[PDB]
Symmetry: C3
Subunit: 327 residues, 3 copies
């Protein structure tokens, strides 16, 4: 209870759209703030930092973790939430996205927006007076997931510089791995990244190209594979795996069918207890969730399974973010 | 010192809100001044604890963005709480009736906010409820709190409500907002002129106009029906209040372009006037108007929150 | 201070009527009464400020969802409004993973599920207490507690009553928990089981109770009708709806046969088994029952999270 909760001043009043916005020092300030929030909350302390402030969720596509995490974080800061549901709104009388933004912006202090269109967040930004926090924009980015994933690595392993990390699964559509790769390469001295995915679902060039300067000058090693090889298993300090983003492959064309099929047919990427016999002693398995069969329930009892603790780090990072934006 | 800064409107204490007809001119002004004061405190960053421990339950049988969210935000900004009941996930799917649903919410709540597709639904709810019910829209009947926030908007933007010329535009037949607004303005203020701008099949109902004939006569209000935003409607109106289309189809189509407000049509409007829309809008109110200082239909929603604070506080004080 | 939590419930999941002792039930009853006095006098409680309940409803509710949230709020607590329809279940997430998810952020989970054994599977992974708000045709333990608060407050005594349990007793999770709670912890004079044969109280509820039934000498009679005898002797007529998703009507005419001092109860919602003509009778306790439910849920949440 003697710990301060200094807001991160550079976040004040700003929208959060991309992992690109953050400096290394922003990241560590949010990490220590989140960690102090965790200590206070776990000790049973009641925070009243955002009394009388309102978050409104605008979720134009589904969420459990993200919506609930954000609501919980707001509440644990003493904040409030208006439970707006897009599916039961005047969008059903033809209301536009822009008008819907202005509508909840009339009542709220912060908007949390998730949308299947990558450019919808920009549209919202151009009409909103209050900050908007990007909780996922199609296959674009998920910048607060990247921050909490980094809190997880820091808290679990004790260090982010020097790690070897595998990014596994649907890298093409994974807004989580897009933001995470950006945030780690821009701001830390990463030893090596394994990009583990079948050919069709590899990390996009529009993510890798902007990073090419920093990759080359910081000496980050980048290796593509289509499988969890013995080498990937033995060298990785972090195995970060992801779900096939099937709802992004809905055009019913021969290509979407072949891309959907590649996860199981063009790659060997399942993590289970058999495969975990190859891992380091000091390493963690992470997954943004939800998972399907790429991450077996046989790993759940393993102490290196960090994907449940990841969600709780998530709540505290979101608290740190909300307090900083709104202080 | 909240009785100096935020005194509740006594006449509203513990009462249900169902119709624009139930308010006096003094009621309206007291709500306006209270709403202005709520706004000043909230905008200054001050945190209100007036309704801590009190619960509002929204009971929305129709879709809403403004009215649902507005009411929740207003309750929360008063320090109160909201129980997020949703009809579609409720025991109504086990054959439960409307009176029983009301009694249920009534056992937990301090105030109910009800929107329903049927006009007589409020009367049924009232006959059974022990706590106040606020009518958030009853079929094609009324929307009494929209009429209050609309009046707050006029008052705050133009300085005065007496003496205005207002056009009510669009689907006046099914528009519960214009039914409530026409009643609140004509009953309580001295309006100079109302233009009722609609194709014939969607004109203002007689059941709204006939009970008003006495106030119309005593105050000498001028009422003109048009099927277009004519040069004259555009030149004389202090307020253009337009609405979304909710024989009627054919007349609507034929009139659409003539009742559309866009930047080209605004070249004929007064320098000092406002465009209002309770929202949501479709094509009858062009996005080309959004940058015009006279476009008041976004600020109108924020006035709504403060007016709803004023209402909730007066009801529950 | 004036609202001592029930110590035995601290940090515990609530899954069955069986887990309560008579002393537990009375401590909750007196706590719920004290909570009701403070709330009805206008006092604001701040007991659970900063604590979160997440409802996890895999089926429809009106009363149960609302009264849990209202109770939480009136203790000063907060609610995270998780929806199953708008969630990552649609992306393929399992029930266990869903539980772990709400568990990362919440202090207490309130779970309702069409599968009888989903609550057990939930408990095997949750760190925080789960309150069973109804598991299939199994139990509804907090309904049985509020029903007993209702009987206590309305009649003054639970020992000695004659109670009729009426309707769909086979699928009625409410009458399962309530029979268990009454028979184990009180000395009931007589239970009428009023149901057609196909919907009678199940053997898996009656058999575990046979020892208590026999040693307290509870009378148990099965009928398929609300006979004049049931009507004249019952202190409580507890009636229920046909559980469709899985001569008994009470109307003003039938009520001419009831005692002066008795109550009609119904967990709700009702269909035509309980006529609107009964609603203005002072013995119609089924609306007041919902309000006792809110206070008993306050006593429960406070005791769980103190
Ligand atoms: N829940 C995360 C990961 C996923 O959906 O697979 C997201 O929305 O991006
Ligand atoms: N939102 C207003 C007007 C409209 O729907 O167009 C109402 O609910 O009545
Ligand atoms: N509402 C009670 C009784 C019923 O549904 O009829 C239950 O959930 O079990």
């Amino acid at each position: 209870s003697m710990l301060e909760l200094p807001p991160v001043a550079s976040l004040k009043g700003k929208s959060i759209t991309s992992a690109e916005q953050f400096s290394r020092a922003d990241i560590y300030a949010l990490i220590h703030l989140a960690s102090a929030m965790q200590r206070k909350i776990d000790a049973g302390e009641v925070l009243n930092l955002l009394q009388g402030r309102i978050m409104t969720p605008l979720f134009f596509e589904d969420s459990s973790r993200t919506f609930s995490s954000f609501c919980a974080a707001m509440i644990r800061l003493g904040g409030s939430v208006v439970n707006f549901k897009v599916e039961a709104s005047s969008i059903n009388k033809g209301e536009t996205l822009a008008d819907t933004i202005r509508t909840l912006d009339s009542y709220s202090d912060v908007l949390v927006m998730r949308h299947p269109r990558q450019d919808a967040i920009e549209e919202a930004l151009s009409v909103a007076q209050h900050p908007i926090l990007n909780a996922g924009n199609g296959a674009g980015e998920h910048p607060t997931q990247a921050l909490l994933d980094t809190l997880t690595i820091h808290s679990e392993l004790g260090s982010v510089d020097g790690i070897t990390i595998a990014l596994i699964g649907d890298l093409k559509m994974g807004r989580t791995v897009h933001s995470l790769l950006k945030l780690l390469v821009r701001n830390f001295s990463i030893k090596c990244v394994f990009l583990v995915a079948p050919d069709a679902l590899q990390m996009p060039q529009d993510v890798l190209e902007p990073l090419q300067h920093e990759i080359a000058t910081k000496g980050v090693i980048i290796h593509r594979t289509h499988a969890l090889t013995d080498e990937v298993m033995q060298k990785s300090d972090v195995l970060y795996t992801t779900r096939l983003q099937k709802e992004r492959f809905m055009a019913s064309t021969s290509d979407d069918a072949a891309a959907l099929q590649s996860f199981a047919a063009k790659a060997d990427i399942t993590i289970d207890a058999a495969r975990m016999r190859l891992a380091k002693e000091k390493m963690i398995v992470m997954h943004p969730l939800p998972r399907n069969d790429e991450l077996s329930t046989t790993v759940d009892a393993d102490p290196r399974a960090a994907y449940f603790r990841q969600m709780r780090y998530g709540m505290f990072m979101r608290m740190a973010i909300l307090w900083s934006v709104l202080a």
